[PDB]
Design a protein around this ligand. Structure first.
Ligand SMILES: [Zn+2]
Length: 461
RNA sequence: CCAGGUCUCUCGUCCGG
RNA sequence: GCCCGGACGAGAGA
């Protein structure tokens, strides 16, 4: 992606939208019980912690575009992935306005608790004003579509979230692009049946994990994988996606029968944004805050990996690639070992910056022991070897527990961390509780015991 | 007094069949 | 007891 121009939106007709400047994150009752290095991200330029210019930092992600042409390997990747999706029999029809707004089998309603975006946000208009889940009233929405159309500008906000130390000093705050309610609805009418088919079929056919529940899905994954794992990280995945990758995406869409809506992807490519007193325009790339980005990113990952294997290994048989992506995250396999250092090499030629998995300094063999997906490791149950624990390391959980956005949520927050934590084993878990229970508020909390959780997990199969 | 996207999963609360 | 569903809130993950 690349910025094409900035300029006081006042000089191009667009309103000024100002985001809050204060973090909602505050130290927990557990802030000193557990160790941690993360702190709330920089939300403004006038932030003390900064050791470099903010706006330079937060926009520096738009690294340019290597390719624009879909070459022979990408094309073969497209044909192969599309053929896979074809086996699912994806309903290619538009989704009616009512289901695109209110949800259907495999697709959740629009989120009524979030912003309606432009221009409703300058009009003080809210999703709740327009939508009614009880009546599923489409009349008002239809009128707003008629009135304001689609392809509206996105509103840029900095994400209020925890960030490591260097990322706070370095101003590496992440940006949110608030999609318009009109565009979310139009995207869902166009692609809802695609979204639903993905959500209903996490696994190696979709090559997507959207819709999976790790506690159960972790047991299916090793069985789905071929003998030899491989994996790697991308640096700035979304930003490094060149136009060629979207064309390839539109090609997959045409092939599976959505050919008549591929213009939507184009719109996703040339986007206008409002940040405070300014307005910019980006050509290339796909705003994280648009409908479907999670699916599209995962689909592109599938293309990317097929492409690199074709380029790197002559005569590789894609039918024996088994991979599952969640956006840019991925666990992949092949009956014979594939070298991620060699894949990362070929990736350069497509504008992809690939590095060893899990921030390793070097590319090393990926094994069931070091492999991670969705931040969780894979560990067979001691008692029942076929049942696999998604193991999230405690470090992450300790970071989370040290902060709250509203202490009235402490119980739910800590309970939820517990459901993540216990997979580390009874000993690590019981220590977690002891530490929680080492302060009075922790002793007022109702927390599940290991054996209750373990039994619940066994029973869930 | 509010403000801050798209999704998935899960848990909790409340309410139902 | 066990299923199935809804509304709202939260957490994590991408
Ligand atoms: Zn433009």
């Amino acid at each position: 992606g690349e910025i094409q121009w900035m300029r006081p939106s006042k000089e191009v007709g667009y309103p000024i939208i100002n985001a809050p400047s204060k973090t909602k994150l505050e130290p927990s009752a557990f802030h000193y019980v557990f160790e941690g290095v993360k702190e709330p991200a920089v939300l403004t330029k006038n932030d003390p912690r900064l050791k470099t210019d903010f706006e330079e930092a937060i926009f520096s992600k738009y690294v340019g575009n290597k390719i624009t042409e879909v070459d022979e390997y990408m094309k073969e990747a497209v044909d192969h992935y599309a053929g896979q999706l074809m086996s699912l029999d994806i309903n290619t029809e538009q989704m009616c306005l009512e289901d695109a707004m209110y949800g259907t089998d495999g697709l959740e309603a629009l989120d009524l608790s979030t912003s309606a975006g432009y221009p409703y946000v300058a009009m003080g208009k809210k999703k709740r004003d327009i939508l009614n889940k009880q009546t599923r009233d489409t009349k008002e929405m239809q009128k707003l579509l008629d009135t304001y159309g689609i392809n509206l500008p996105l509103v840029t906000y900095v994400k209020d979230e925890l960030r490591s130390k260097t990322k706070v000093e370095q101003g590496k705050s992440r940006l949110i692009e608030a999609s318009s309610l009109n565009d979310s609805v139009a995207m869902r009418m166009a692609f809802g049946n695609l979204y639903a088919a993905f959500h209903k079929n996490p696994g190696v056919i979709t090559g997507s994990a959207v819709g999976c529940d790790p506690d159960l899905f972790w047991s299916k994954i090793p069985v789905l994988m071929e003998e030899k794992l491989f994996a790697f990280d991308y640096t700035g995945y979304d930003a490094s996606l060149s136009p060629a990758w979207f064309e390839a995406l539109k090609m997959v869409l045409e092939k599976i029968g959505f050919g008549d809506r591929v213009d939507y992807i184009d719109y996703l490519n040339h986007s206008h944004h409002l940040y405070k007193n300014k307005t910019y325009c980006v050509k290339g790339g796909m705003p994280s805050g648009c409908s479907g980005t999670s699916i599209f990113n995962s689909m592109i990952n599938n293309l990317i990996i097929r492409t690199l294997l074709l380029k790197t290994y002559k005569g590789i048989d894609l039918d024996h690639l088994k991979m599952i992506a969640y956006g840019d995250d991925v666990i992949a396999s092949y009956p014979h070992e594939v070298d991620a250092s060699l894949l990362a090499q070929s990736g350069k030629d497509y504008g992809l910056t690939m590095t060893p998995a899990d921030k390793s300094a070097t590319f090393e063999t990926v094994t069931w022991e070091n492999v991670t997906f969705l931040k969780r490791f894979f560990r067979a149950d001691e008692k029942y070897p076929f049942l696999i624990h998604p193991v999230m390391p405690m470090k992450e959980i300790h970071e989370s527990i040290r902060w709250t956005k509203d202490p009235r949520n402490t119980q739910d927050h800590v309970r939820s961390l517990c459901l993540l934590a216990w997979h580390n084993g009874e000993e690590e878990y019981n220590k977690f509780l002891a530490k929680i229970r080492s302060v009075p508020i922790g002793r007022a909390l109702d927390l599940p015991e290991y054996s209750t959780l373990y039994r619940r997990w066994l029973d869930s199969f």
